[PDB]
Design an enzyme around this catalytic site. Structure first.
Site, PDB file in Angstrom:
ATOM      1  N   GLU A  80     -55.450   7.620 -52.858  1.00  0.00           N
ATOM      2  CA  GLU A  80     -54.033   7.735 -52.513  1.00  0.00           C
ATOM      3  C   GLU A  80     -53.675   9.143 -52.033  1.00  0.00           C
ATOM      4  O   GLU A  80     -53.966  10.126 -52.716  1.00  0.00           O
ATOM      5  CB  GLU A  80     -53.174   7.370 -53.733  1.00  0.00           C
ATOM      6  CG  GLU A  80     -51.669   7.368 -53.509  1.00  0.00           C
ATOM      7  CD  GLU A  80     -50.895   7.136 -54.801  1.00  0.00           C
ATOM      8  OE1 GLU A  80     -51.552   6.950 -55.895  1.00  0.00           O
ATOM      9  OE2 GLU A  80     -49.617   7.290 -54.829  1.00  0.00           O
ATOM     10  N   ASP A 280     -63.926   8.375 -69.230  1.00  0.00           N
ATOM     11  CA  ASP A 280     -63.364   7.031 -69.207  1.00  0.00           C
ATOM     12  C   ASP A 280     -61.866   7.115 -68.911  1.00  0.00           C
ATOM     13  O   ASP A 280     -61.076   7.458 -69.788  1.00  0.00           O
ATOM     14  CB  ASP A 280     -63.613   6.357 -70.563  1.00  0.00           C
ATOM     15  CG  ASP A 280     -63.321   4.865 -70.553  1.00  0.00           C
ATOM     16  OD1 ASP A 280     -62.199   4.468 -70.177  1.00  0.00           O
ATOM     17  OD2 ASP A 280     -64.215   4.088 -70.948  1.00  0.00           O
TER      18      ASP A 280
HETATM   19  N1  NAD Z   1     -47.609   2.683 -56.985  1.00  0.00           N
HETATM   20  C1  NAD Z   1     -46.686   3.474 -56.446  1.00  0.00           C
HETATM   21  O1  NAD Z   1     -45.747   3.886 -57.122  1.00  0.00           O
HETATM   22  C2  NAD Z   1     -46.788   3.883 -54.961  1.00  0.00           C
HETATM   23  C3  NAD Z   1     -45.641   4.336 -54.296  1.00  0.00           C
HETATM   24  C4  NAD Z   1     -45.690   4.704 -52.953  1.00  0.00           C
HETATM   25  C5  NAD Z   1     -46.888   4.623 -52.256  1.00  0.00           C
HETATM   26  N2  NAD Z   1     -48.058   4.170 -52.901  1.00  0.00           N
HETATM   27  C6  NAD Z   1     -49.300   4.082 -52.095  1.00  0.00           C
HETATM   28  O2  NAD Z   1     -49.037   3.239 -50.950  1.00  0.00           O
HETATM   29  C7  NAD Z   1     -50.107   2.279 -50.800  1.00  0.00           C
HETATM   30  C8  NAD Z   1     -49.570   0.882 -51.045  1.00  0.00           C
HETATM   31  O3  NAD Z   1     -48.434   0.666 -50.176  1.00  0.00           O
HETATM   32  P1  NAD Z   1     -48.427  -0.564 -49.137  1.00  0.00           P
HETATM   33  O4  NAD Z   1     -49.661  -1.351 -49.406  1.00  0.00           O
HETATM   34  O5  NAD Z   1     -47.124  -1.247 -49.327  1.00  0.00           O
HETATM   35  O6  NAD Z   1     -48.495   0.152 -47.676  1.00  0.00           O
HETATM   36  P2  NAD Z   1     -49.003  -0.153 -46.160  1.00  0.00           P
HETATM   37  O7  NAD Z   1     -48.033   0.405 -45.181  1.00  0.00           O
HETATM   38  O8  NAD Z   1     -50.410   0.276 -45.987  1.00  0.00           O
HETATM   39  O9  NAD Z   1     -48.959  -1.752 -46.062  1.00  0.00           O
HETATM   40  C9  NAD Z   1     -47.741  -2.413 -45.702  1.00  0.00           C
HETATM   41  C10 NAD Z   1     -47.699  -2.604 -44.199  1.00  0.00           C
HETATM   42  O10 NAD Z   1     -48.689  -3.576 -43.810  1.00  0.00           O
HETATM   43  C11 NAD Z   1     -48.091  -4.523 -42.912  1.00  0.00           C
HETATM   44  N3  NAD Z   1     -48.547  -5.898 -43.252  1.00  0.00           N
HETATM   45  C12 NAD Z   1     -49.394  -6.544 -42.409  1.00  0.00           C
HETATM   46  N4  NAD Z   1     -49.723  -7.710 -42.953  1.00  0.00           N
HETATM   47  C13 NAD Z   1     -49.068  -7.722 -44.077  1.00  0.00           C
HETATM   48  C14 NAD Z   1     -49.124  -8.777 -44.971  1.00  0.00           C
HETATM   49  N5  NAD Z   1     -49.871  -9.853 -44.707  1.00  0.00           N
HETATM   50  N6  NAD Z   1     -48.403  -8.697 -46.106  1.00  0.00           N
HETATM   51  C15 NAD Z   1     -47.653  -7.622 -46.370  1.00  0.00           C
HETATM   52  N7  NAD Z   1     -47.592  -6.595 -45.515  1.00  0.00           N
HETATM   53  C16 NAD Z   1     -48.299  -6.629 -44.364  1.00  0.00           C
HETATM   54  C17 NAD Z   1     -46.592  -4.399 -43.006  1.00  0.00           C
HETATM   55  O11 NAD Z   1     -46.036  -4.296 -41.683  1.00  0.00           O
HETATM   56  C18 NAD Z   1     -46.337  -3.120 -43.789  1.00  0.00           C
HETATM   57  O12 NAD Z   1     -45.683  -2.153 -42.958  1.00  0.00           O
HETATM   58  C19 NAD Z   1     -51.182   2.631 -51.804  1.00  0.00           C
HETATM   59  O13 NAD Z   1     -52.177   3.398 -51.124  1.00  0.00           O
HETATM   60  C20 NAD Z   1     -50.480   3.500 -52.846  1.00  0.00           C
HETATM   61  O14 NAD Z   1     -51.346   4.575 -53.318  1.00  0.00           O
HETATM   62  C21 NAD Z   1     -48.003   3.799 -54.267  1.00  0.00           C
HETATM   63  C1  MEV Z   2     -43.486   9.164 -56.725  1.00  0.00           C
HETATM   64  C2  MEV Z   2     -43.414   7.817 -57.468  1.00  0.00           C
HETATM   65  O1  MEV Z   2     -42.087   7.296 -57.313  1.00  0.00           O
HETATM   66  C3  MEV Z   2     -44.434   6.839 -56.840  1.00  0.00           C
HETATM   67  C4  MEV Z   2     -45.907   7.232 -57.073  1.00  0.00           C
HETATM   68  O2  MEV Z   2     -46.697   6.874 -55.933  1.00  0.00           O
HETATM   69  C5  MEV Z   2     -43.782   7.956 -58.967  1.00  0.00           C
HETATM   70  C6  MEV Z   2     -43.037   9.026 -59.767  1.00  0.00           C
HETATM   71  O3  MEV Z   2     -41.797   9.126 -59.665  1.00  0.00           O
HETATM   72  O4  MEV Z   2     -43.697   9.762 -60.529  1.00  0.00           O
END
Ligand code: NAD
Ligand code: MEV
Lengths: 384, 374
Positions: A80, A280
């Site tokens: 990430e 771990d």
């Molecule tokens: N867990 C958290 O709090 C957090 C917060 C913000 C970002 N992230 C990071 O962002 C990433 C995950 O975000 P994401 O996966 O939403 O981002 P992403 O932009 O990579 O994926 C979503 C995009 O893919 C496209 N898409 C195409 N086919 C799709 C489908 N079949 N279904 C759904 N969307 C589709 C959409 O247009 C959309 O813009 C991870 O790498 C994570 O580390 C995590």
């Molecule tokens: C930035 C956040 O909103 C998403 C982490 O990807 C989490 C936090 O607030 O610590």
């Protein structure tokens, strides 16, 4: 000096060389990072079962981190983006006020000796407490080498559960002082060692004899101070960001939905350091989250306040069961290299660094969320 | 066929070749596992910041796993031993009764639009609910392509907190149906998209606009059945092990200290599958543990009962925000290979497999703990 000018702009090889002569790493070390395959297949086939190859993740190094004055380079391993960029930025901000101030407690892990079949749990409890020193001696007699290093069993705590679905239970706790080890195996053995004696005293039937990942006795602390002037952006002022950060914290302290993500952010900094050291990461997560809801309410792990001086003060206290002499820590060529870059000499020293990286990450995550939004930074760093 | 005779005795290369022609993998695929450096430094330097090299962990493959009849090879990535050995053994036991039966819900993630500065949170709440469809339309108009795939905003849920330390707050929830993506970025954008309108209606001041990892709306289920005769050891009998497994569960359900380790075991199976697929393992952990204490008490994620038929029945239900089109899932040569071995076509399909591996692991962990006594 942890500060690395234009490090993010430097090429991977340029970075590896810079880090190389800075720490005075031998070519033998730089080669482990320079070329792929630092972990031989004969060793990789010794750690897990059904090994068919190896999976690799980016190995980064955060900068600016300063713990108790001493500068230190923190190695991280994640997929990430923005994590390494935020942890280093907030670390740069904390420098101006003394970096991060940490502290820890004695590496106290505790085993559990579940005893069922007792008809008088409460009475049997006192029987154990009165013959505590016996139970302790037997435990230590098993691991004398640990006692040589200053570790060993310290005290026994018997708890009861007459309200158990499967009848009343008696759970004794073996508060064992591990040293530079997580204590998993060290503790588990002592638990199975005293199992017969406890069973003889209470007259019950011992069931499980395992350690508890909720190591609330092995806590690690970290503090920070952020002057409002430092958080002053083009749009928002210093004072404006502080209140936002405070609103963001209040939200996580009262609503579990925000607390989940908030704590997740904290882990984003702690976990990468754990994987790099060969520890771990799942044990850390279990003890972290469980401790977050110790008051019957899933809340925030960190605390954000505004001292009567106007400054923003944040803290972090949580179980940190991490080691240096563990199984995977000693067999992975890079796990050993990570410890060398850190310069840590004890497990608790590493524990203090882990909670500092997390406290920093959470600060960066909230600063952005309150400043503009989360997309500006993460997404920019989330190219391709 | 997921069963792999003497696989553990086979050499790494032997295993990689066996898995190769079994799945019909091209040499181009086997080479990614055969040689080190499947992840080029130019790509590794694009994922994280301050990259100086790469860190590698063992890449194993569990066997015997059978989900809803269909056999499947589960790729795992960990450093702790016994994990892959236990997950495969319990999987072998479940086969005799239909393997693992899973199910899931629509990939429903939800954003949070925190609004402070409102003097009348409760009244302002109804203002939002009454103009819900407006807020929904605006959200969807942003991600047009998502709606093309069948995703998009579904409903808004406004909640209040007049008891907040920093005054009253108004937290609206955007229940967005992502598809094969975790939804992080998809949701976060829609949250910032509607932020202005909500602010106009309530007259407050929007603060955070982030997703909630506590995805209790994106659950994944898994069930198992273990005949007592199967658990019959040399010392302990089948019936004897079942009661022990039940005692071990009761313990975790009432005491948080055991629950922590108990749930940790569950994650020992789920996390490795997540790292292999290139998904954010931390999001999974956060949503897992938070859901474990949703009743003001940190309890067990799995449930172990003994049906009126004498058999041991266990289940697992938890948030499973995992994807297939995510950032790291697409850029990592092995992440794509992991999905190929799994044969998954959707995110929820992968979600169902993840909870099955966990339910199996927990079963193996407890079986041993109860089997070898004093
Ligand atoms: N867990 C958290 O709090 C957090 C917060 C913000 C970002 N992230 C990071 O962002 C990433 C995950 O975000 P994401 O996966 O939403 O981002 P992403 O932009 O990579 O994926 C979503 C995009 O893919 C496209 N898409 C195409 N086919 C799709 C489908 N079949 N279904 C759904 N969307 C589709 C959409 O247009 C959309 O813009 C991870 O790498 C994570 O580390 C995590
Ligand atoms: C930035 C956040 O909103 C998403 C982490 O990807 C989490 C936090 O607030 O610590």
């Amino acid at each position: 000096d942890s500060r690395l000018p234009a490090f993010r702009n430097l090429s991977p090889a340029a970075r590896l060389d810079h880090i190389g002569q800075l720490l005075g790493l031998s070519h033998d070390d730089v080669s482990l990072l320079a070329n792929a395959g630092a972990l031989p297949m004969d060793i990789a086939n010794g750690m897990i079962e059904n090994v068919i190859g190896t999976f690799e993740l980016p190995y980064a190094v955060a900068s600016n981190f300063q713990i108790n004055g001493r500068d230190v380079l923190v190695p991280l391993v994640v997929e990430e983006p923005s994590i390494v960029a935020a942890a280093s930025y907030m670390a740069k901000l904390a420098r101006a006020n003394g970096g991060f101030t940490t502290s820890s407690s004695a590496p106290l892990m505790h085993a559990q000796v579940q005893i069922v079949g007792i008809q008088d749990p409460l009475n049997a409890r006192l029987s154990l407490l009165r013959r505590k020193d016996e139970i302790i001696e037997l435990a230590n007699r098993k691991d004398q080498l640990l006692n040589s290093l200053g570790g060993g069993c310290r005290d026994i705590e018997v708890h009861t559960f007459a309200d158990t679905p499967r009848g009343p239970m008696l759970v004794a706790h073996l508060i064992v002082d591990v040293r530079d080890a997580m204590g998993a195996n060290t503790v588990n053995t002592m638990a199975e060692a005293v199992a017969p004696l406890m069973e003889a005293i209470t007259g019950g039937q011992v069931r499980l004899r395992i350690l508890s990942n909720l190591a609330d006795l092995r806590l690690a602390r970290a503090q920070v101070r952020i002057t409002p002037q430092q958080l002053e952006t083009a749009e928002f002022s210093g004072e404006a960001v502080i209140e936002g950060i405070l609103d963001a914290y209040a939200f996580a302290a009262v609503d579990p939905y925000r607390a989940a993500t908030h704590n997740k952010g904290i882990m984003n900094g702690i976990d990468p350091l754990i994987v790099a050291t060969g520890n771990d990461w799942r044990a850390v997560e279990a003890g972290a989250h469980a401790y977050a809801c110790r008051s019957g309410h899933y809340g925030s792990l960190t605390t954000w306040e505004k001292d009567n001086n106007g400054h923003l003060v944040g803290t972090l206290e949580m179980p940190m069961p991490v080691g240096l002499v563990g199984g995977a820590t000693k067999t992975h060529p890079l796990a050993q290299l990570s410890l060398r870059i850190l310069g840590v000499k004890t497990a608790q020293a590493l524990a203090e660094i882990a909670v500092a990286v997390g406290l920093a990450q959470n600060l960066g995550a909230m600063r952005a969320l309150a400043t503009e939004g989360i997309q500006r930074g993460h997404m920019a760093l989330h190219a391709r």
